[PDB]
Design a protein around this ligand. Structure first.
Ligand SMILES: CCCCCc1cc(O)cc(O)c1C(=O)O
Ligand SMILES: CCCCCc1cc(O)cc(O)c1C(=O)O
Lengths: 96, 96
């Protein structure tokens, strides 16, 4: 199952801060059992004002809750939630 | 590079139609050289009213244009564009 985050940063957040934000988020994989993998990226096309995408892999929808209530994720939010202006969350199983 | 589509269908579109829509879109990989891979899925969490996600792989941002102007993609849009109510498009390179 993929946990997909689409976000916009507040205008005051700097590039260095954004880098630190994603570095810290990626490193949660090592701390949170339920998180299997993380990739992120910045939209280059600007067709739509979301700018960044994060893809997180889980074994199942069930274990997403394990991540949600994990002190490390709660802690990540407690430190960084002032960074984002808007976000969208999706959970789905990629298929053909 | 990943070409990410987030969409909502119009209310009148049926499940069978949605299945046919994605089946046809997935099969474009065989027709359009620039398209390397496609996955799609339906959001189960409904936390946000986008419902579906499509992930398309390209070799580079440059070749996304090759896809955009390809008669098969233009043709796909010509047949199915009345199906969607809203969509968002992002192009990014997944990284850590
Ligand atoms: C890079 C964004 C990480 C935090 C994203 C987030 C924010 C929030 O306010 C509530 C959530 O359930 C989640 C999530 O499911 O991951
Ligand atoms: C499953 C949605 C396929 C069509 C998505 C689309 C719609 C549109 O109106 C303009 C576009 O440039 C694209 C695209 O880049 O793929």
């Amino acid at each position: 199952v993929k946990h997909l985050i689409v976000l916009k940063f507040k205008d005051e957040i700097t590039e260095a801060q954004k880098e630190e934000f994603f570095k810290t988020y990626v490193n949660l994989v090592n701390i949170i059992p339920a998180m299997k993998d993380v990739y992120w990226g910045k939209d280059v096309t600007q067709k739509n004002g979301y700018t960044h995408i994060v893809e997180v892999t889980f074994e199942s929808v069930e274990t997403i809750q394990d991540y949600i209530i994990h002190p490390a994720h709660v802690g990540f939010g407690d430190v960084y939630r002032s960074f984002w202006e808007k976000l969208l969350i999706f959970d789905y199983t990629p298929r053909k």
